[PDB]
């Protein structure tokens, strides 16, 4: 079958009033895997960062009592964390063993089924070129240690996944694709955040295909090109998990009458009421934007929507774009999808009136997600 992985972010519960979403309220039958963002690191060991995280782990893993086939993964890293803790940890065999041993202990004591590595990124952002090789060594050693622990304790092996960059230059400087594909269970490809406001033009967050004005390096800023790059450079199709964002990016239009894709912008758009991130809106916040009168366009060239009201423009994903991408990933024999983050889908059903988790429910249906337990 297909996997449907779903992130829960620790900060989702701290959004105000109706934006607050707690992990215990995830539907246990919606996803095949839940990924908790994030663990941190201390003295080359994985760790939690707040006692509240431990309450989240209890709630998240408690969902496995309702869907006994559900798996949980603990993610370490992310953009904000950056590369430096990973560079230090991979730099010596001793530090890698300290880390690997801590991961086995931590995942087993907190009832997680596996680890998601999310180093952003080996070989860039200050991480030296040697980290492309040392990341591959870390992943091989982690996979071997997981195999050994499974044999020792006669229990199913811990899963090992990694994020994979969506920008071709970052992929080249960071990832030994054939070796990583050998040792990882899955590669979660970060097919999102594809147009940043630095360029000064509106662009889609996760278009399936290129726009006619995407020239040169921009021609690869789409899901189809990125996944093709990973496969062309030796990744196993069935191990690739495509990133499906449950949010969009916002822009301020230079001219409110020039409101298409590729039109000039002034800056990123303002933070939303609930998510409070400059240049981003959750899908549930975009439903409000639409309800408040934004003009909604489905761009068939890129197979994604955008919407605008006054000088605010948002490029995002909706039920239709998720449906078209799900058909494309089945047609391309991919491993499945990861919803980043589940907590920005309309978890309550109150913002969009499309039922609970409308984006993710679309993927569950169209990827035929099921397990023995949920029947």
Author numbering: 0 to 374
What does the article say, verbatim?
Although mice do not encode Gal10 in their genome, they do form pseudo-CLCs, made from the chitinase-like proteins Ym1 and/or Ym2, encoded by Chil3 and Chil4 and made by myeloid and epithelial cells respectively. Ym1 (encoded by the Chil3 gene) and Ym2 (encoded by the Chil4 gene) are CLPs belonging to the glycoside hydrolase family 18 (GH18) and are unique to mice, with no known human orthologues. However, Ym1 is mainly expressed by macrophages, neutrophils and a subset of circulating pro-repair monocytes, while Ym2 is produced by lung epithelial cells, which could have discrete context dependent benefits.
In hyaline gastric lesions of aged 129S4/SvJae and B6,129 CYP1A2 null mice, pseudo-CLCs were found to consist of the closely related CLP Ym2, which is a protein mainly made by epithelial cells under the influence of IL-13. Spontaneous crystallization was aided by low pH and low temperature (4 °C). The low root-mean-square deviations (RMSDs) establish structural similarity. We showed that recombinant in vitro made Ym1 and Ym2 crystals were structurally similar to crystals isolated from mice and to each other, and when administered to the airways of mice, crystalline Ym1, but not soluble Ym1 protein stimulated innate and adaptive immunity and acted as an adjuvant for Th2 driven eosinophilic airway inflammation and immunoglobulin secretion.
